[model samples]
Target: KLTFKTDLEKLEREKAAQIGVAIVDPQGEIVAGHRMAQRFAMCSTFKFPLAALVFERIDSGTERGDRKLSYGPDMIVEWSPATERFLASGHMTVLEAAQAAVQLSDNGATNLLLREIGGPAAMTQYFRKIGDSVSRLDRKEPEMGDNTPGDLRDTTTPIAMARTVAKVLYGGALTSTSTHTIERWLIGNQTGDATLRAGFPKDWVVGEKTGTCANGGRNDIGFFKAQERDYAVAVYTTAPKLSAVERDELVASVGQVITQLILST
Candidate 1:
């Protein structure tokens, strides 16, 4: 017999759009999703782990959260709503900058954190040290120009990032305090209206990060909290050859279905 779950799973995979989603249950089961391993440009979604790596340094005493970085006209980056407040003051703490990166997708603040943490190489290095072997970050944000290197486009697979989040948050890869801090920062995210935030139940809580880029790529990954349960999901929409409105609806549809899965579980 054709079950509803089976049909829904088929519908998710058969779409012409490039999409990947990975869902995990409370018992650490890889529950439901389709194309969960396809790689897509990570865009801002990479910042979530970037923040984690920086916090790891802080916990290890290699970096300080209270450390300050000063900015100037040269540091100005477009699409930086979260960091614009500090432009007048010309400085912010490391933790504050990270908050902007996660909450507002602040490109300028992200670059500053990259410089402090020793750049893209360090980001991928830490990623490999963790469980994510396929994701890569090879260039600074808002900098991939026409001559952008092939290997330099930041990327991650749906399952790869979901597992990465799980390993860090629940797999004992980080200290309890560090884990809590990162989750708190993720909860502070204020972006993603047409994505996960819009698709989930109004009262339920989501701790996630969103990413968008050229070629119609859109991505989001994080944990969903339901009463008496916790789950993680990663949804990536890749190069959908549809109108912007259609694309947005596609992402939202995925989110809504995922929400149903969570509620049913």
Candidate 2:
């Protein structure tokens, strides 16, 4: 009843754009893909990994979720309903900050976590240690601003991203309790409901994170479960000249196709 595969091909052809998609099974094996091995700007998608890193610290007793953090003027940025109220209020708990970073995709909240966990380079190091060497978060969220010229913004390969999410969900990267906590945080992500979540089958449930950069970069990466199958999917795209509305729609369409692709398997 659906032509998800051809529909996806046609959409990409019509848009004349390139998108990277990697779908992995529950065991961390690639099942289907397009430009899956290539690395692309991760945008806010890196927030997921950063969140994991923070939880790892907490699991190890190096940090506490109840710790209070203050919001500074420098942490302010555009497109954040998650942390805006704190601008004047000046503070929030680490747990709340983590919600802002993982669920609402708050730039300020994300920067706080980034700076708290030792900035971008350290975050990248943690990702590397967790078996995602190809992914890198080299700068703070505000510093990534529109993926400015001559600098690489946060980056990740769909395959490694899929594997990373797989590890997050399946364990070994964090203790059982920590991984369980992180998985719940992921399912609660509210940012890309219109994109990846919108495309899922009625019976499927997905836990995901999304990334959007100025000049048309849109990405979503996570795991979804169907009747008998569990899969990890990462879709990264760039059509820099297009409008945000257009790119979002495109990412949703791609998500729909991925859902179909997984169901068919």
Candidate 3:
């Protein structure tokens, strides 16, 4: 269903002029790509693999996430938050923090867990081990802010991430026991879409992350599950006016356009 019409080439090219894209089918096949000729930094989405570092520790026979870690003053970010500005000095299990990191897009929580583990270097290894040829996760620098900034580039191509989802779900080529844990967390991720999520029906479950900077550079990556089949996808873009809601709609529109291509094929 991913095939395109000959006439769609011009339109496709136009679409990608504003957005970057990559997609893999249920069988782990690449369907199409645009602006994938380069690498791009993924914002909070890298938390997915940073979380893997924790899961890997658990799989390595460490009693990880068994206890809660507090996000006291040490864990606070210099950035602004009107209410709940600083993380409460109580407990959040490593696993819970992982969810907050991904689902809630909590930058401070992400840094806390990252500090506990080995930070970006360790994060990169987990990403590579899982087969992301062009993607590496990095800790956000002081200026990267809530979005993937111009600096601190831990990069990935759209196709590379889509393929990463495929590898995690397929199970046979796994390098370690934490594979299932990673897959489960990805499948259960609550926040994502407006892009990929909008394309699929409500009953079709999608697990992924949405990343946007103040400048409107956005990315959504994850798998779509429906009627026993899954489609993995990544859509990223950098636009003129970088509002989250606007960017979300842009990503979602691009996603629907891609899915429309697949379905009508």
Candidate 4:
């Protein structure tokens, strides 16, 4: 009676949404996938990897977290609470910006970090360097979330993102310190309380980044530890027909399905 495909398909039908999921077991193999190869708007999920790239520079001493960067009202955009708080000071440290980007999904901080490391192209190249060919970041925040129907900009597949999450967090793509730092940041994520994180058991250790687009794209990607095993998961939902609360609940329902699949393994 434990049918992954059937349950997921039912969820899609009942929610009137399209769902894409990929779960990478601890062995680095994708154990479960549904529409895993299809493209979806990454939204703010791109900030997770962006933080990794920034931490890499910090780990290598090429960039110091304490280095402060100044910004003005021109750089502020929607959904930038963390950055807005620093407007009076007019500056923030590299570490603070990266933390804001990942933990709070702060658009202003994300753009600043993007500027620090290069830009959207640098993020794409970082993925390429890390062996992810299907993920790309073609624009900055707010604009990046413009998930035009057929446009491929700022998109990633479920499998591609799952792999990227696994490699960066568990495959030694980063130094232990950097990996731990990013993990801590993910663990502290404040934006995903009702999404993937809500589906997991209370005792399990889960850290996730959530992405929401004005175009009805909702995504959550990250790692979790269950029953002494680690698993990387990516869930992307496009529920234009559903309200925001409905979309969140849909993703949470998928999360429950994913947890069932993981526990079965």
Candidate number achieving the greatest TM-score relative to the actual structure = 4
* Cα misplacement distance, residue 258 of candidate 4 (Å): 0.9
lDDT of 1 by residue, 129-194 (tens): 986798888888775311222433677778888888877777776788988988887777887777
Candidate 4, 1-265: lDDT as tens digits: 2488999989888877889999897546988899999999999999999999988888888899999999999989998998999999999899999999999999999999999899999999999999899999999988999999999999999999999999999998889988998998899899999999888888889999999996789999999998688989899989898899888888889888887877776
Using all chains and alpha carbons, the TM-scores for the candidates as numbered come to 0.88, 0.91, 0.79, 0.97
Instruction: Give one digit per residue, the lDDT tens place, for model 3 in 1-265.
Output: 3343332344345544256677787556877666654565676566665665676676665637666777566555643131134355455677777666767666667776776777777677777786665776554633443344555366677777777666765534444556666666666655664555776667766677766554456778777766566677777676655456766766776666676665654
For candidate 2, the C-alpha RMSD (Å) to the true structure equals 2.4
Q: What is candidate 3's local distance difference test score?
A: 0.63
With a 3 Å backbone cut-off (N, CA, C), the pairs that clash in candidate 3 are 1-262, 194-252, 195-252, 216-242
Candidate 4 is scored at a TM of: 0.97
* Candidate 3 root-mean-square deviation in Å: 4.0
* TM-score of candidate 2 versus the correct structure, residues matched by position: 0.91
- Ranked by lDDT from best down, the candidates are 4, 2, 1, 3
Cα lDDT tens digits, model 2, 20-105, are 88888877887878878876888888888888888889889988989988877767787667678887888877778887888888
* Candidate with the greatest lDDT versus the true structure: 4
Local error of candidate 4 at 48, Å? 0.2
Off by over 4 Å in 3: 1-17, 78-86, 141-152, 172-190
In angstroms, how far off is 221's CA in candidate 3?
0.6
Per-residue lDDT of 106 in model 2: 89
- Looking at model 2, which ten-residue stretch has the lowest summed lDDT? 144-153
The per-model lDDT (C-alpha) reads: 0.77, 0.80, 0.63, 0.91
Question: Clash pairs of candidate 1?
Answer: none
How much is 69 displaced in model 1, in angstroms?
0.9
